[PDB]
Amino acid sequence: SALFEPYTLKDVTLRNRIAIPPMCQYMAEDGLINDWHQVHYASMARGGAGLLVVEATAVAPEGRITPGCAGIWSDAHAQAFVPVVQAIKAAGSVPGIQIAHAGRKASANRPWEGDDHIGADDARGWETIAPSAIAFGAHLPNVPRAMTLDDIARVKQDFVDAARRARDAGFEWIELHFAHGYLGQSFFSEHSNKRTDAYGGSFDNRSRFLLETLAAVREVWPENLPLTARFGVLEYDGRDEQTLEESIELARRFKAGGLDLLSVSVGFTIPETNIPWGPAFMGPIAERVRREAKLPVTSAWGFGTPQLAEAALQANQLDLVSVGRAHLADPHWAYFAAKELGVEKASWTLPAPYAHWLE
Amino acid sequence: SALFEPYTLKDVTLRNRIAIPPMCQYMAEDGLINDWHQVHYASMARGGAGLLVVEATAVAPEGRITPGCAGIWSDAHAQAFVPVVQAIKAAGSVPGIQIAHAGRKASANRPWEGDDHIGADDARGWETIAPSAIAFGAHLPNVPRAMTLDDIARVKQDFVDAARRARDAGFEWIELHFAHGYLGQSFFSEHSNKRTDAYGGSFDNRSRFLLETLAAVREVWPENLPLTARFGVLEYDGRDEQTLEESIELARRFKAGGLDLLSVSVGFTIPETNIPWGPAFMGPIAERVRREAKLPVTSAWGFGTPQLAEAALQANQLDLVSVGRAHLADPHWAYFAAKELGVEKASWTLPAPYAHWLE
Numbered sequence: 031s032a033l034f035e036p037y038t039l040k041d042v043t044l045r046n047r048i049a050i051p052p053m054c055q056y057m058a059e060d061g062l063i064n065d066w067h068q069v070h071y072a073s074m075a076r077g078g079a080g081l082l083v084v085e086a087t088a089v090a091p092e093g094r095i096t097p098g099c100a101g102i103w104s105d106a107h108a109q110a111f112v113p114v115v116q117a118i119k120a121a122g123s124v125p126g127i128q129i130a131h132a133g134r135k136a137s138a139n140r141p142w143e144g145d146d147h148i149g150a151d152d153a154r155g156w157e158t159i160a161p162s163a164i165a166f167g168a169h170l171p172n173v174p175r176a177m178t179l180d181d182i183a184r185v186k187q188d189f190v191d192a193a194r195r196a197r198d199a200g201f202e203w204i205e206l207h208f209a210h211g212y213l214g215q216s217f218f219s220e221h222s223n224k225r226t227d228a229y230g231g232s233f234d235n236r237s238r239f240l241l242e243t244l245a246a247v248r249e250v251w252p253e254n255l256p257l258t259a260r261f262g263v264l265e266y267d268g269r270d271e272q273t274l275e276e277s278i279e280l281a282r283r284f285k286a287g288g289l290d291l292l293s294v295s296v297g298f299t300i301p302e303t304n305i306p307w308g309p310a311f312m313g314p315i316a317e318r319v320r321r322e323a324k325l326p327v328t329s330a331w332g333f334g335t336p337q338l339a340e341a342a343l344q345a346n347q348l349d350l351v352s353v354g355r356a357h358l359a360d361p362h363w364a365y366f367a368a369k370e371l372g373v374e375k376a377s378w379t380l381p382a383p384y385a386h387w388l389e
Numbered sequence: 390s391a392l393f394e395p396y397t398l399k400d401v402t403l404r405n406r407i408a409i410p411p412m413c414q415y416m417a418e419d420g421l422i423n424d425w426h427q428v429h430y431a432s433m434a435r436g437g438a439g440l441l442v443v444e445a446t447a448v449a450p451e452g453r454i455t456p457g458c459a460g461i462w463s464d465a466h467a468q469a470f471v472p473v474v475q476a477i478k479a480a481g482s483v484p485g486i487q488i489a490h491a492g493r494k495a496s497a498n499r500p501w502e503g504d505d506h507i508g509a510d511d512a513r514g515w516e517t518i519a520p521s522a523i524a525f526g527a528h529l530p531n532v533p534r535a536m537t538l539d540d541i542a543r544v545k546q547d548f549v550d551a552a553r554r555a556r557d558a559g560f561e562w563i564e565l566h567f568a569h570g571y572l573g574q575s576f577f578s579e580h581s582n583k584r585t586d587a588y589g590g591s592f593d594n595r596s597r598f599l600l601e602t603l604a605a606v607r608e609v610w611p612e613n614l615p616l617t618a619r620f621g622v623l624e625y626d627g628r629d630e631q632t633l634e635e636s637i638e639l640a641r642r643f644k645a646g647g648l649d650l651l652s653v654s655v656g657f658t659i660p661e662t663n664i665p666w667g668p669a670f671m672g673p674i675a676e677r678v679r680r681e682a683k684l685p686v687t688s689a690w691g692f693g694t695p696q697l698a699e700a701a702l703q704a705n706q707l708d709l710v711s712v713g714r715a716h717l718a719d720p721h722w723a724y725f726a727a728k729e730l731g732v733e734k735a736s737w738t739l740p741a742p743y744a745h746w747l748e
C-alpha cells in the first residue's frame with residue numbers, strides 16, 4: 031500500500047504517508063494547552079499516523095482565532111507543549127506544529143458558541159490586525175486595524191520567536207499558516223490587501239510578507255528539520271486560473287527560499303465564493319502545484335475514505351495524505367485504513383496492548 | 390435506542406448502557422500505572438461509554454497476572470489512579486475498577502511476550518498461591534502453593550484495603566474479579582479446589598471465600614455506590630447444567646449479601662473445555678442468570694456489532710452491554726454505535742471539539 035510507505039524529508043522519517051493536519055481544539059486558556067490536548071494528541075499518535083501537526087498555535091495573543099486557541103508567544107506557553115511533543119514521539123509518530131496569526135478573523139467565538147466575531151461589550155474580545163482596514167464580512171464583521179511597517183516587523187519577529195520556541199520544545203516539523211484567510215493569506219490576496227506601500231499592489235509586494243516571514247523563520251529553524259507552510263492556492267472566486275498561476279509562482283519562490291513541503295489548501299479569504307466541496311476535490315489542484323512548482327505536497331478534504339488516500343498517492347497527486355475529521359471520529363483511523371487496504375499485520379499499526387488482541 | 394438509555398444503580402447514573410469492561414494493558418511497572426493508562430482510559434471515556442471499568446488491578450503483588458499488571462496494594466498505588474478517575478469523570482463517564490488476584494494464573498509473561506508461566510530461572514517470576522496445589526496445565530504449568538488459613542485471612546484483608554483505596558481514590562463503581570480462573574473462581578470450582586477444610590468440598594465451603602470476601606468488602610465500600618462482581622457461571626466442561634444451577638444459587642447469595650450487579654462470564658478454570666465462541670453467545674446465559682437470580686447483569690464477547698448490543702437490551706438479556714476489543718480498535722466506539730443505530734444528534738456522543746464538526 032502506497033499509504034503505508036515510509037517518507038523521509040530532511041532528517042525526519044515518517045512511518046507512513048498518513049498525516050494528521052492541524053485541527054484547532056478551542057480548549058486552551060490564555061493560550062496554554064492542558065489535559066484536553068494531552069490526551070487528544072497522544073491518542074491520535076498512538077492510532078498510527080506517521081505525522082501529527084498540532085493545531086494553529088498563535089505567535090501573539092491577538093493572533094488567536096478565539097479565546098480557546100493555543101499560543102506559543104512565551105516560553106511558558108512553549109514548555110506546555112513539551113509533554114505533547116514527547117507523547118507523540120513515544121507513540122512513534124512525528125510531532126509537528128502549525129504556527130499562526132488569525133489576522134482579521136481573530137477575536138471570534140468558539141465554533142459551538144456562535145462562531146462569530148466577539149461583541150464589543152464582551153470582555154473577551156480584542157483589536158484585530160490585517161494588511162488593510164477591511165472586514166471579512168458576514169459573521170466576521172469587525173473591521174481590523176491596518177498594520178504599520180512596525181507591526182509587520184513585529185509580527186515577523188513573533189513568527190521567528192515562535193519557531194525558536196517550537197524547536198526547543200522538541201517539534202521536528204513546522205508549518206507556517208499562510209492559508210484560510212488568516213494574516214498571511216490576507217497579505218497575498220487582492221481582496222483583503224489594498225496597501226500602497228511595499229507590501230501591497232504588485233505580485234512581488236503581496237508576496238513580500240510571506241516570503242520575508244519564511245526567510246526570517248528559515249534563519250532560526252534547523253536546516254535538518256522540515257520547514258513547511260500551508261497556503262491557499264485559489265479562492266473559487268471566479269479568478270481561479272490567474273490566482274492559481276500566481277500561487278504556483280509563489281510556491282516556486284517558497285522552494286527557492288528553503289521550503290521543504292507545501293500543504294496545498296483553499297484561500298477562504300472572503301465569503302463570496304463557490305467552493306466545489308467533494309471527496310478529494312483538492313487532489314488535482316495539489317497535483318498541479320506539486321508538478322509545476324516541483325515541491326512535495328500534502329492536501330486534505332475527504333481523504334478519510336482509505337481508497338481515496340491510496341489512489342491520490344498512486345497518482346502522485348501528493349506525497350502525504352492529510353486526514354483530519356476522520357481522526358476526530360476515530361483516533362485510530364490509521365489502523366482502520368490499514369485493515370481496509372489489506373495491509374499485512376494491520377493491527378500492528380497500533381501499539382502492542384491493542385495490536386496483540388486485534389490480530 | 391435502548392443502548393443509549395441512561396441507567397441508574399444506587400446513586401450512580403450512567404449516560405447510556407455501554408460499559409467498557411476491564412481490559413488488562415500489561416503496561417504498569419511494579420503495579421504503578423503511568424502515561425499509557427492515563428491516555429488509554431481518558432480517550433475511551435471521551436468516546437462516549439457511560440461506564441469505564443478499569444482493568445484487573447491486583448490487591449497484592451503476587452496477585453498480578455504479569456509483571457505489567459496494575460496494582461492497588463498500597464496508598465501510593467491508589468493515588469496513581471486519581472488522575473484516571475478524574476479524566477473519566479471529566480469526560481462524563483463513570484469510573485469503575487476491577488480488583489483482582491490472579492491465583493494460580495499469576496506470574497505469567499505478557500501476552501505478546503509468550504503468554505505463558507514465567508520459568509523458575511527467570512527472576513521476574515514469583516510463587517503463586519491457590520486453594521490447592523494443582524496447576525492449570527497447558528501453557529500455565531506452574532504448581533501453586535496451597536493457601537494457609539492465614540493466607541486466606543490476608544488476601545481477604547487485601548481485598549478490603551483495595552476497596553478502601555478505590556473508594557478514597559474516587560471510583561464510583563467496584564467489581565470483584567471472581568471469574569476467569571483466577572483466585573476467586575478457583576475457590577468455587579471443584580476442578581481447582583480440593584481443600585478439606587472450611588473452604589473446600591461442599592457448595593457452602595467452596596462458596597465461602599467468595600461470600601466472605603464480598604462481605605468484608607461490603608463493610609468499607611459505600612452503600613450508595615454499586616458493588617459488583619464478575620463470575621464465571623459455567624465452564625463448557627461437560628458439567629454445564631449442574632455448574633449453572635450452583636452458580637445461579639451463589640448469585641442469589643451474592644444478592645442477599647448486597648451485590649448490586651453481576652458481570653456474567655465463563656470460568657476459564659481449566660484448559661480442557663469446549664467454549665462455543667460466537668457473536669453474543671453469552672446472551673442467553675446472562676438472561677438466565679438475570680431472570681433466575683433476580684440481579685441486574687452485564688456480559689461480553691462480540692457485542693461490538695451495535696445491532697447485537699441493541700438486541701440484547703431489548704430482549705432484556707442484559708442491563709448493560711460490555712464492549713471491549715471494539716474500544717481498543719476505536720476508542721470512540723460509542724459514537725460509532727450511536728451513528729449506526731441512528732441516534733439523534735449522534736455526534737454529541739463525543740465532546741464539543743469533536744461533536745461540532747462531525748454533525
Ligand SMILES: Cc1cc2c(cc1C)N(C[C@H](O)[C@H](O)[C@H](O)COP(=O)(O)O)c1[nH]c(=O)[nH]c(=O)c1N2
Binds near residue numbers: 054746
Ligand atoms: C476541528 C477542525 C479544526 C481545524 C480544521 C478543521 C477542523 C475540522 N482545519 C482544517 C483541517 O486541517 C483540514 O484541512 C480539513 O478538516 C479537511 O480535511 P478532512 O476532510 O477533515 O480530512 C485547520 N486547518 C489549519 O490549517 N489549521 C488548523 O488549525 C485548522 N483547524
Ligand SMILES: Cc1cc2c(cc1C)N(C[C@H](O)[C@H](O)[C@H](O)COP(=O)(O)O)c1[nH]c(=O)[nH]c(=O)c1N2
Binds near residue numbers: 412619692
Ligand atoms: C486486552 C484484553 C484484556 C482483558 C480482557 C480481554 C482483552 C481483549 N478481559 C475480557 C474482556 O473484559 C471482555 O470480556 C472480552 O474482551 C470479550 O468482550 P469483547 O468481545 O472484546 O467486547 C478481561 N476480563 C476481566 O474480567 N478483567 C480484565 O482485566 C480483563 N483483561
